[PDB]
Amino acid sequence: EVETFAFQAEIAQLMSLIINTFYSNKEIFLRELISNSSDALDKIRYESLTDPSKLDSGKELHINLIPNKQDRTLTIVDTGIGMTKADLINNLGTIAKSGTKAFMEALQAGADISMIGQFGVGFYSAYLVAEKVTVITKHNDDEQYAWESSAGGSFTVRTDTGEPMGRGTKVILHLKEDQTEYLEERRIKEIVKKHSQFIGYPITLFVEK
Ligand SMILES: OCc1ccc(Oc2ccccc2)nc1
């Protein structure tokens, strides 16, 4: 059972801008997704300070980076607070309408795409490198769901029957054919060291063989 939704017009506009603007500094997508993961981990940690049972779904607070050259995917896994179905539909838990408005005003006033995270819509930088993004998520208060979009104005939401995650979010980037550098260990390490040195959670880069 798959539900198909239209993006709000302003979010479709944001994604079109990200996909169509010539902008070479694509590597910032990883900083933005890791920052979202850190924010998610902060939220479940804060909730656990007064209610330890919030961590019954998993006590470990971490971020895993999983490249897969056979599938051409880069997956960013966190064990943060996750998102409900309602969160997924409401632009992955963002205030994306007002964030997009502020972002595009900043771009016409001299900003560049790398500042996207300052406007709370950093998730959508995934489309700098991905032709399709799948988000699997599990929040303590809801069931496990899969969101997916190849842009083009629509996204789908379905109950996920895949491997149970316990709690957290998995962002699966189906990379564009010319963006496979972001599956290479030395490239991912370089980006993490450059942009994510002060993230307060362990970031484990998985290797392949
Ligand atoms: O990288 C995009 C992304 C978006 C959301 C997300 O989970 C949450 C869920 C609730 C609050 C903060 C973060 N994790 C990754």
| Ligand 1 atom 13, closest CA | 40
Atom of ligand 1 minimally distant from the CA of 35? 1
For residue 113, what are the contacts with CB-CB under 8 A and spacing of at least 6? 18, 21, 23, 25, 28, 107, 125, 128
Pocket flag, ligand 1, residue 171 (CB < 6 Å): yes
Structure tokens at 25: 């500094």
Distance CA 173, CA 72 (A): 8
Give distance in angstroms: CA of 124 to centre of ligand 1: 12
Q: How far apart, in whole angstroms, are the C-alpha atoms of residue 139 and residue 142?
A: 5
| Cα gap 182→99, rounded to integer Å | 27
User: How many domains is the chain partitioned into structurally?
Assistant: 1
Q: What CATH number is associated with residue 105?
A: 3.30.565.10
Range of the domain at 197: 2-205
DSSP sequence for 108-166:
HTT--GGGGGGGT-GGGGGGGTEEEEEEEEE-TTS--EEEEE-STTEEEEEE--SS--S
Q: What is the resolution of this structure in A?
A: 1.7
